[PDB]
Ligand binder design. Structure first.
Ligand SMILES: NC(=O)c1ccc[n+]([C@H]2O[C@H](COP(=O)([O-])OP(=O)(O)OC[C@@H]3O[C@H](n4cnc5c(N)ncnc54)[C@@H](O)[C@H]3O)[C@H](O)[C@H]2O)c1
Ligand SMILES: [Mg+2]
Lengths: 469, 151, 51
DNA sequence: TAGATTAGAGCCGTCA
């Protein structure tokens, strides 16, 4: 008979200085934090893709319902939720004829055809950007199904361009970085899920009961990419800086040259929220190692400290590093040499590879969300996925797994670490969901890392998150 | 009066009714509806008729397929017409058209000569129309507070 | 009797009608139009005949 | 020969 503790919901902040624990309800009751005037869209694709996009835009100007409004809050229509206009008249079309696609998706070598198709789209996008008089807020790329189907790494059809990944999405995002063009890739079957079927007369993907959720997700993504602030955190304590770290393989290179990318977050002293990537991919030549050599650790921590000092005016009073791996002693000493006198440095480790499950003995519903077993003063199990009583369901299907949080380096309070980690699950702008299973300091760093690894020509990349998601 | 009455065909028009009630209450209008109270049974009719006849300034009817030829809604319309004649107010019932299947050729006699607000194309346009009509007709209101709707 | 009535077919001739009504209002006249001054929820044939 | 950490890919369910 051990003991469990409970951690309360973090709460998030919306228009008019009102707080709620749900993004859907908070946006459908008050509205976002800033005021876009409208979204002028730029669509690129075939004529059929343009027709499908126009259909979808006309669709989401009106209320959309889910089968269970309690489980999934409705969608009251785009312009009532967001107080800005995004309709099918500010659209601009740039054709990509099937003649262009046919001559390229036949090379039988995944690399070359991926390169050719990425070029076919991005050359038109850049031409439109540099030599036309419109002001396009976001670029929407309607990708036919065949283009996405076979451009995967390990999928077969039934040297100059070899310095690139074998993925359409990653290479597309990486090769547009120096132009700074917000983009949203759409599969053709997602926007029109009714007309893509199988040998049964039924949709491949059935969205009939979850249409409102899809509308929420797409609308929030589009709104964020055009420069909107949907929500912010509630009571982030001043003086604390968070910093994610994730390592990534490099693959097509003489050496694995493990790359490390970070994501920085703090409070801007205007009671705002600064959440931007602090990235220039630092490398490690040794194969299979996930530790930085002292020089890269020094440079990384110095860069993060300088970013904070410039954005605020004085150094952090507390810095937390969230990683998926443990830190060796040389790396931590490197970190400590370049850290100010009055700044506490704490390194944490979040892992999913640990078998521990808890079963409710009575019913058929899973454990609650805010629970946590505190093994020690330097370890604990935190449930971030579980039954949420506000929506009357669990975020998973089967018995969920907890996160294992360890204070590997430094000295802090495990209760504060757990509380902070739980409150970082509420800033997933790539999704419109109640909560996420991982802190976003560790999820957006990964997304940055997996984009600026599909190429090598990028130097001094942008930090804003809207060029990678 | 100070209150706005909403008549709808429970339980088919619940989504729109909840949406509209929450939006109006978040804008400073006091709304009386059969979904905002979890207690029923005693005086299931007296209270409703008393509220219509005593302290109701506006009567909003959710005109849809379910609400046409619905006994409770018809009785509500009868009481509303009586009160409207008593008050000598020409604009007291304001139908809301939310159903695409309900053609204007097949609406109730009690509301067939009245200018209805359209919601079929988009709900935000309908809300804008309702707010502009209320402002023009000087419907009493409170300073808009979304916290009421949140609570 | 100082209102200029405008009769048209709705919604096929809405662009020209709205243009003309806005122009005549700008010039200073009083204009009654099926798409800009009819009320919502009012007996419309009777009001039109009265106008 | 083991134990103990790490990162890639691929596939399937979301309602009733
Ligand atoms: N421009 C015109 O054609 C014009 C001008 C003046 C009057 N009218 C009358 O003739 C029209 C004939 O319309 P239709 O049947 O061909 O097409 P319709 O009813 O689908 O569209 C016509 C418009 O519908 C609205 N409407 C009709 N009945 C209404 C009601 N009970 N409550 C609220 N709005 C209502 C009005 O704005 C009307 O102009 C309307 O009955 C009335 O306005 C037409
Ligand atoms: Mg995205």
């Amino acid at each position: 008979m051990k003991e469990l503790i409970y951690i309360e919901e973090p709460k998030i902040l919306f228009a008019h200085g009102q707080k709620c624990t749900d993004a859907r309800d908070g946006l459908a009751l008050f509205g976002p934090l800033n005021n876009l005037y409208g979204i002028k869209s730029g669509v690129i694709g075939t004529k059929q893709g343009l027709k499908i996009f126009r259909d979808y835009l006309d669709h989401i100007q009106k209320p959309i319902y889910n089968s269970n409004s309690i489980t999934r809050p409705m969608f009251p229509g785009f312009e009532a939720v967001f107080d800005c206009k995004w309709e099918s008249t500010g659209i601009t079309f740039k054709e990509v004829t099937n003649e262009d696609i046919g001559k390229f998706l036949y090379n039988s070598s995944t690399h070359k055809r991926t390169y050719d198709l990425v070029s076919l789209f991005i050359d038109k996008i850049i031409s439109a950007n540099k030599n036309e008089d419109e002001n396009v807020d976001v670029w929407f790329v309607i990708v036919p199904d065949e283009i996405y189907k076979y451009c995967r790494p390990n999928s077969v059809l039934p040297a100059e361009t070899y310095n690139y990944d074998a993925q359409f999405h990653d290479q597309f995002k990486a090769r547009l970085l120096k132009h700074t063009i917000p983009t949203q890739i759409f599969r053709e079957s997602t926007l029109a899920w009714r007309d893509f079927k199988n040998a049964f007369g039924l949709p491949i993907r059935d969205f009939s009961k979850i249409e409102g959720h899809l509308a929420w997700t797409i609308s929030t993504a589009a709104f964020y990419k055009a420069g909107g602030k949907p929500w912010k955190l509630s009571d982030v304590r001043n003086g604390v800086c968070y910093l994610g770290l994730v390592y990534k393989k490099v693959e097509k290179s003489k050496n694995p040259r493990n790359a490390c990318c970070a994501a920085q977050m703090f409070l801007d002293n205007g009671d705002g929220t600064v959440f931007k990537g602090e990235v220039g991919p630092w490398y490690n030549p040794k194969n299979g190692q996930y530790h930085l050599e002292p020089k890269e650790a020094k440079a990384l921590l110095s860069q993060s400290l300088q970013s904070y000092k410039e954005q605020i005016g004085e150094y952090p009073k507390e810095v937390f590093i969230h990683a998926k791996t443990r830190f060796n002693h040389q790396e931590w000493d490197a970190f400590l040499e370049v850290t100010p006198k009055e700044t506490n440095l704490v390194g944490v480790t979040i892992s999913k590879t640990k078998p521990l499950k808890l079963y409710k003995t009575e019913g058929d519903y899973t454990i609650l969300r805010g629970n946590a077993y505190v093994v020690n003063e330097r370890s604990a199990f935190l449930w971030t996925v579980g039954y949420v009583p506000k929506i009357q369901t669990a975020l998973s299907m089967e018995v969920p797994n907890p996160l294992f949080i360890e204070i590997n380096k430094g000295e802090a309070d495990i209760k504060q670490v757990l509380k902070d980690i739980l409150s970082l699950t509420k800033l997933n702008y790539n999704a419109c969901i109640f909560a996420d299973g991982e802190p976003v300091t560790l999820r957006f760093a990964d997304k940055i890392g997996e984009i600026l690894t599909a190429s090598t020509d990028i130097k001094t990349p942008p930090l804003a998150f809207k060029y990678y998601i | 009066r100070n209150k706005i009455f909403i008549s709808h065909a429970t339980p088919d028009d619940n989504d729109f009714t909840r949406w509209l009630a929450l939006k109006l209450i978040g804008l400073g209008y006091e709304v009386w509806c059969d979904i905002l109270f979890l207690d029923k049974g005693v005086d299931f009719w007296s209270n409703i008729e008393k509220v219509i006849r005593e302290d109701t300034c506006k009567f909003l009817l959710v005109s849809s397929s379910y609400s046409n030829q619905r006994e409770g809604v018809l009785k509500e319309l009868a009481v509303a017409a009586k009160v409207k004649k008593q008050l000598k107010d020409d604009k007291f019932i304001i139908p809301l058209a939310i159903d695409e299947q309900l053609s204007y050729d097949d609406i109730n006699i009690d509301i067939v000569r009245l200018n209805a607000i359209d919601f079929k194309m988009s709900w935000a346009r309908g809300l804008k129309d309702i707010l502009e009509a209320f402002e023009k007709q000087k419907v009493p209101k409170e300073v808009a507070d979304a916290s009421k709707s949140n609570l």
